Amino acid sequence: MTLSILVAHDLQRVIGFENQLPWHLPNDLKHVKKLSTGHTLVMGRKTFESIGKPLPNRRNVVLTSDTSFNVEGVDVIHSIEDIYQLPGHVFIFGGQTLFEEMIDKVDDMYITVIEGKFRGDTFFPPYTFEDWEVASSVEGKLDEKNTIPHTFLHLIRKKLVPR
Ligand SMILES: NC(=O)c1ccc[n+]([C@@H]2O[C@H](COP(=O)([O-])OP(=O)(O)OC[C@H]3O[C@@H](n4cnc5c(N)ncnc54)[C@H](OP(=O)(O)O)[C@@H]3O)[C@@H](O)[C@H]2O)c1
Ligand SMILES: CCCc1nc(N)nc(N)c1Cc1cc(/C=C/C(=O)N2N=Cc3ccccc3[C@@H]2C=C(C)C)c(OC)c(OC)c1
């Protein structure tokens, strides 16, 4: 319905390594909890297995081809097309495969740019700021617990108009 991407990627758009996040950043976890609370998270199967259980107080939706999939607290879908029937604010939550499938369909993106270069094996698709308006850009606060510089972006797809 209202369709957003929600993602953390590094300076080279790495989002993951060995089915885990490359970095430890509690503030971003806090950012995710705040944004998606009361809403819906759609994620691919590997992302779900990585987390290992549903996130509380959210509708959790998992896209998989596995007809045997029936986890407590999770709604299953089997097609991309299923996503557009989900009501409310829906966040595309990962991973790489779902980002690639959805980045041209979403209204907007909440991206946490991790200002570092990590070793990765999964990536967020390339995108241009030519196409995305910076609705907001907020530096994350560093401290003892959060030690990689990072920036919370809210990007909104630009309309194509005649010049
Ligand atoms: N930094 C971030 O913000 C962020 C966000 C989330 C995850 N990540 C990460 O991203 C990584 C995983 O990415 P990934 O691409 O390999 O896996 P993934 O997107 O999480 O999910 C992979 C799977 O979802 C399925 N799927 C995708 N499209 C489908 C369709 N059209 N119809 C039916 N099923 C479909 C399949 O499940 P089946 O094989 O069971 O059919 C597929 O193999 C990890 O390393 C992880 O840590 C990071
Ligand atoms: C950690 C953030 C990763 C990420 N970042 C961004 N920007 N986009 C994103 N789309 C994600 C996705 C993402 C997520 C997570 C973590 C989820 C999680 O542990 N919570 N999610 C919300 C939630 C809701 C209710 C209760 C508890 C939680 C809990 C937060 C705590 C306070 C403990 C994750 O596991 C570490 C992970 O690994 C592949 C990926």
Residue numbers of the domain that contains 83: 1-163
CA of 21 to the centre of ligand 1 (A): 13
Query: Residue 141: which residues within 8 A CB-CB, separation 6 or more?
Result: 27
User: What distance in Å separates the CA atoms of residue 69 and residue 53, rounded to the nearest whole number?
Assistant: 13
C-beta separation of 8 from 114 below 8 A: yes
Q: Which residues does residue 44 pair with via DSSP β-bridges, in sequence order?
A: 63
Q: Which residues have CB under 8 Å from 61's CB, separation 6+?
A: 40, 41, 42, 43, 74, 75, 76, 77, 83, 86, 90
| Separation between Cα atoms, residue 107 and residue 59, nearest integer Å | 20
Q: Within 13 Å, how many C-alpha atoms sit on residue 92's CB side?
A: 26
The phi, psi pair for 104, rounded to 5°, reads -85, -5
Q: What is the CATH number of the domain that holds 115?
A: 3.40.430.10
d(CA 36, CA 68): 27
In the numeric block, the tokens 């241009």 are attached to 128
Cα 28 vs. chain centroid, distance in angstroms? 11
Cα 90 to averaged position of ligand 2 atoms, centre (Å): 15
Question: Contact at 8 Å (CB) between 119 and 21?
Answer: no
Tokens of residue 91, six digits = 């966040």
CA distance to 41, 122, 153, per residue, from 83 (Å): 10, 22, 24
What count of other Cβ atoms lies within 10 Å of the Cβ of residue 109? 23
Q: How far is CA 136 from the centre of its chain?
A: 17
List CB contacts of 163: < 8 A, sequence separation 6 or more: none
Indicate if ligand 1 lies below 6 Å from the C-beta of 83: no
Total domains, the chain: 1
